Amino acid sequence: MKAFEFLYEDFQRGLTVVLDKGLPPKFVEDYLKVCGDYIDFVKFGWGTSAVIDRDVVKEKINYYKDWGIKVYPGGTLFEYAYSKGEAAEFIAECKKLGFEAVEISDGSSDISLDDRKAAIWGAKWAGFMVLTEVGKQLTIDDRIKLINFDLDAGADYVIIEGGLFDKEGKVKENELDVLAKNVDINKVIFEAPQKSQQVAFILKFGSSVNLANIAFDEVISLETLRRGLRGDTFGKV
Amino acid sequence: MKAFEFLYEDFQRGLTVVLDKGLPPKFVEDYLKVCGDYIDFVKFGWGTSAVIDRDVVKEKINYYKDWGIKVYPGGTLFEYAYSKGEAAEFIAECKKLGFEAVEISDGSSDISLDDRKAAIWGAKWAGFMVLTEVGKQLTIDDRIKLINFDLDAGADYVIIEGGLFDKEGKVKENELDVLAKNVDINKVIFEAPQKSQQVAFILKFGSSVNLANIAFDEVISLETLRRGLRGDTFGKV
Amino acid sequence: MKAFEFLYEDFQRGLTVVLDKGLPPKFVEDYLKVCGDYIDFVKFGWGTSAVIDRDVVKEKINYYKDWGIKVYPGGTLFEYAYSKGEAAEFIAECKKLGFEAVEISDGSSDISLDDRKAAIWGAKWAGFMVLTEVGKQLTIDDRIKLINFDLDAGADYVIIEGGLFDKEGKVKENELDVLAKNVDINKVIFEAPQKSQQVAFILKFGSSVNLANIAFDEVISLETLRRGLRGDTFGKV
Amino acid sequence: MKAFEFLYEDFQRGLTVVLDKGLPPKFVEDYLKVCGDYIDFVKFGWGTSAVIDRDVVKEKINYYKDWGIKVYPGGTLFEYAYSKGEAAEFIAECKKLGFEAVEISDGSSDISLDDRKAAIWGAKWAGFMVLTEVGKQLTIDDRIKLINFDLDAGADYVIIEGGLFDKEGKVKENELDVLAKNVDINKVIFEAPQKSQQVAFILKFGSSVNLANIAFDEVISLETLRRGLRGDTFGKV
Numbered sequence: 022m023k024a025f026e027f028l029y030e031d032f033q034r035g036l037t038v039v040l041d042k043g044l045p046p047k048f049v050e051d052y053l054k055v056c057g058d059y060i061d062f063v064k065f066g067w068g069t070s071a072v073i074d075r076d077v078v079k080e081k082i083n084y085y086k087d088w089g090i091k092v093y094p095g096g097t098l099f100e101y102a103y104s105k106g107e108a109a110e111f112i113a114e115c116k117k118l119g120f121e122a123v124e125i126s127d128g129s130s131d132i133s134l135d136d137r138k139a140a141i142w143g144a145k146w147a148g149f150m151v152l153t154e155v156g157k158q159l160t161i162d163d164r165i166k167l168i169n170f171d172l173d174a175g176a177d178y179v180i181i182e183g184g185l186f187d188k189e190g191k192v193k194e195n196e197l198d199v200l201a202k203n204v205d206i207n208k209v210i211f212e213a214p215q216k217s218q219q220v221a222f223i224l225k226f227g228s229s230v231n232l233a234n235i236a237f238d239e240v241i242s243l244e245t246l247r248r249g250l251r252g253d254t255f256g257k258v
Numbered sequence: 259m260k261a262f263e264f265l266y267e268d269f270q271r272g273l274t275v276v277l278d279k280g281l282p283p284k285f286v287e288d289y290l291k292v293c294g295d296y297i298d299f300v301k302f303g304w305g306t307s308a309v310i311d312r313d314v315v316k317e318k319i320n321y322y323k324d325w326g327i328k329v330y331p332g333g334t335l336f337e338y339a340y341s342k343g344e345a346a347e348f349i350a351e352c353k354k355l356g357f358e359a360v361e362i363s364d365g366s367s368d369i370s371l372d373d374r375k376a377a378i379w380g381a382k383w384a385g386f387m388v389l390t391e392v393g394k395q396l397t398i399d400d401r402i403k404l405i406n407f408d409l410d411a412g413a414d415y416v417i418i419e420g421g422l423f424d425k426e427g428k429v430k431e432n433e434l435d436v437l438a439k440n441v442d443i444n445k446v447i448f449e450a451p452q453k454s455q456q457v458a459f460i461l462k463f464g465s466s467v468n469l470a471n472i473a474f475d476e477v478i479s480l481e482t483l484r485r486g487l488r489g490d491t492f493g494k495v
Numbered sequence: 496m497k498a499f500e501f502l503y504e505d506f507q508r509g510l511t512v513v514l515d516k517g518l519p520p521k522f523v524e525d526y527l528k529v530c531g532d533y534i535d536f537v538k539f540g541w542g543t544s545a546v547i548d549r550d551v552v553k554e555k556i557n558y559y560k561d562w563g564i565k566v567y568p569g570g571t572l573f574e575y576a577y578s579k580g581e582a583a584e585f586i587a588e589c590k591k592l593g594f595e596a597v598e599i600s601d602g603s604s605d606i607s608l609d610d611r612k613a614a615i616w617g618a619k620w621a622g623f624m625v626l627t628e629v630g631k632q633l634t635i636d637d638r639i640k641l642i643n644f645d646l647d648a649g650a651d652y653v654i655i656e657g658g659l660f661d662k663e664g665k666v667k668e669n670e671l672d673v674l675a676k677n678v679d680i681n682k683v684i685f686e687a688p689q690k691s692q693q694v695a696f697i698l699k700f701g702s703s704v705n706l707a708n709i710a711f712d713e714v715i716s717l718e719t720l721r722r723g724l725r726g727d728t729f730g731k732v
Numbered sequence: 733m734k735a736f737e738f739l740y741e742d743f744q745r746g747l748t749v750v751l752d753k754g755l756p757p758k759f760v761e762d763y764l765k766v767c768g769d770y771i772d773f774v775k776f777g778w779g780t781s782a783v784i785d786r787d788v789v790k791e792k793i794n795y796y797k798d799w800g801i802k803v804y805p806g807g808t809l810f811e812y813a814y815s816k817g818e819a820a821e822f823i824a825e826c827k828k829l830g831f832e833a834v835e836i837s838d839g840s841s842d843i844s845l846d847d848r849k850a851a852i853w854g855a856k857w858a859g860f861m862v863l864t865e866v867g868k869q870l871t872i873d874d875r876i877k878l879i880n881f882d883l884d885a886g887a888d889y890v891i892i893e894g895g896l897f898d899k900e901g902k903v904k905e906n907e908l909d910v911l912a913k914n915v916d917i918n919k920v921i922f923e924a925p926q927k928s929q930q931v932a933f934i935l936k937f938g939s940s941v942n943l944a945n946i947a948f949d950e951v952i953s954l955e956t957l958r959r960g961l962r963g964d965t966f967g968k969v
């Protein structure tokens with residue numbers, strides 16, 4: 022039961038992906054009692070999991086699994102291990118630690134479409150859910166090509182690196198409408214670390230939009246924005 | 259200790275791959291007491307493992323594992339599951355049954371070089387040892403391209419479909435010499451189901467040659483051929 | 496439960512008759528755990544049952560009965576006993592040993608149509624299932640006469656001696672089509688000891704065709720051929 | 733043992749000084765399990781220790797001491813006590829609380845070079861490790877004079893107030909090269925509260941550079957930047 026339960030009206034809620042930079046284990050155990058209902062995925066940011074103690078990483082993953090959250094290591098660590106030639110050992114250690122998903126990217130390295138598809142099948146047949154990063158010359162048509170290529174290669178979701186906002190910070194609605202006409206947006210996730218970006222995507226697509234790089238203390242804020250309980254979206258959703 | 263141990267002279271022994279068509283479980287348990295020292299891999303032929311009871315398949319794999327043998331399902335079962343779109347569930351069931359390797363082939367299907375490389379990484383990152391089948395227009399140079407492509411993609415061994423023998427059954431020694439000049443033959447395995455083929459490869463490359471499709475009752479015959487203890491190779495090795 | 500159970504598609508399976516030349520008792524007990532689901536009848540070949548120890552013959556028959564298989568002695572032993580004038584003692588000993596069927600033939604003897612029908616009723620009223628052998632001058636029309644005569648006399652199945660293949664080894668499809676127009680092929684069984692014959696009948700009549708003289712180690716091979724899990728019938732059935 | 737231990741390559745790591753604004757005691761106890769291996773010193777910021785309960789300050793200092801971290805009160809509290817004439821009582825209370833170092837500064841007060849040297853000896857002979865703050869007219873040569881004066885007076889480290897970055901945010905590399913030619917940079921520490929400054933110093937001097945005013949939640953980020961595990965320093969270190 023929520024406080025003020027009589028104010029609840031039911032709605033379609035999109036995915037939330039949370040960025041964890043290194044939260045303490047028993048802080049995570051208590052933090053999920055407030056907002057574990059509103060998180061779908063957690064990214065351990067970039068290579069941060071390769072810095073932390075191995076029993077601390079396992080203990081944190083068990084706390085997220087008790088709420089049904091899927092945890093994964095950021096794609097920079099895959100690109101690191103891939104550049105060292107260690108990609109099979111990276112995939113094996115992910116399974117021993119207990120991640121349920123992996124992210125494929127070429128943000129710090131160059132990887133061909135042949136190697137990218139091979140890496141996607143590599144991760145699926147190893148038993149992970151697969152996410153990919155798109156956005157790195159790229160017109161909106163070139164993003165549409167890469168998104169469709171990753172979905173046809175078998176990625177479960179595509180993350181748009183965040184492009185979609187102009188020099189002032191207003192959303193480029195023509196490109197965003199062209200994207201929605203050419204791609205199944207139910208399989209797309211947008212990076213929206215700033216509250217103004219979260220408002221712009223919610224006002225464009227409604228409460229069902231999928232969002233990523235959400236800061237751990239803004240999870241409750243985002244749920245109030247989806248539900249119309251903050252002055253930015255009050256009476257608009 | 260072997261009978262007549264004083265006749266033993268030590269030598270470099272190549273790989274043996276045995277073909278199992280459906281041997282009974284407690285027949286396999288007793289059979290390995292005679293010749294388990296001389297087997298490296300067992301192929302469960304084509305789709306035969308998809309016909310047998312699941313507890314019988316597990317029981318057989320445990321008997322081969324007690325002698326350190328690596329068991330795998332033949333490449334036609336991969337092509338079947340791949341043609342149905344079930345390739346990830348095929349890899350998952352292989353792990354649950356306890357196979358330690360898989361074979362990638364296109365003997366009945368058509369698969370591109372791009373899909374073939376993606377399937378090889380698929381199997382490697384899932385933690386299997388990977389074998390591939392080559393031979394299906396192909397000159398000796400086209401075999402050499404395909405062998406090097408599968409080895410560069412990361413196959414642990416390449417099996418040559420058996421081409422290498424003429425219309426009478428004599429070995430095409432010029433093509434076989436061109437192969438040995440362009441490929442690391444320590445990673446190549448030759449199909450040799452007939453005793454005359456086993457003799458031709460042993461006389462060309464010595465006891466260290468790797469051989470496949472060996473019938474279960476010819477394993478002891480092959481060890482006598484490698485060791486010079488049968489009239490075909492007597493005094494020639 | 497079969498291994499890879501998710502690949503199973505349900506189909507109409509025809510009869511399999513297996514030839515036993517003298518398999519050991521506890522080999523049979525273990526062998527049926529692999530392939531007893533895919534056998535309908537076992538022929539003890541020619542006169543081999545008259546050579547073996549009487550308690551060994553009973554012990555083998557009980558192992559086949561535990562899987563619901565019907566065992567019978569080959570028709571050359573009936574022709575032997577009939578030529579000695581001992582046919583009633585042969586029928587009595589079959590019941591004491593525990594065979595559930597008998598085969599009537601004239602492959603080495605000469606027997607009139609009158610005596611043939613009298614022998615068919617002889618075996619039915621004694622309580623056996625009756626099979627007959629046809630093929631010994633005979634055009635396809637003369638086979639069609641003999642098949643209908645044996646079915647009208649009351650035989651449960653007619654076995655075609657295997658005629659149906661040319662001098663190269665290709666099936667004589669014109670005669671085989673004329674047969675299917677004149678005879679109920681659900682009561683016909685074809686001899687097919689070679690894998691090329693098994694493929695030719697499966698491609699002509701589908702998975703539901705009835706086959707005989709199957710070697711004991713080829714039963715799993717035949718089930719993969721019926722199910723399309725081997726390169727000869729892959730994607731054709 | 734770290735997660736992904738096989739990716740570790742050994743390297744020279746510089747000092748990290750962390751700013752604590754008032755973290756809760758049992759939050760600090762859990763937080764050090766994640767990143768206590770990557771902290772050398774903790775500054776209790778400005779006068780914040782004089783606002784907190786005396787048993788809470790002791791409890792926090794004991795949690796930092798269990799990881800070998802040296803805690804100190806920020807130099808504004810020394811300047812406060814010095815301006816009141818109470819500097820000897822401030823030194824006495826620091827020993828009773830259990831700080832292991834002190835910071836000498838004139839950031840808000842005016843103090844002569846005579847009084848500054850007397851304060852450095854005051855703190856050393858009382859048994860503390862001594863840090864000083866430099867930067868307040870000053871050319872890079874005048875910074876060099878003050879750094880050498882504090883090191884000759886006996887300071888264990890000198891902190892550069894953070895000058896070294898231009899009006900756009902780019903590092904003034906000409907002055908930074910002149911500094912490194914005149915001063916032992918192993919005894920210098922740079923203030924770098926922003927990630928762009930931390931990157932600029934790591935790219936100029938390598939992973940061995942000493943950094944200060946690191947936010948408590950950015951300690952794991954900084955260790956990934958030193959180790960090349962984040963896109964800013966990926967492949968550059």
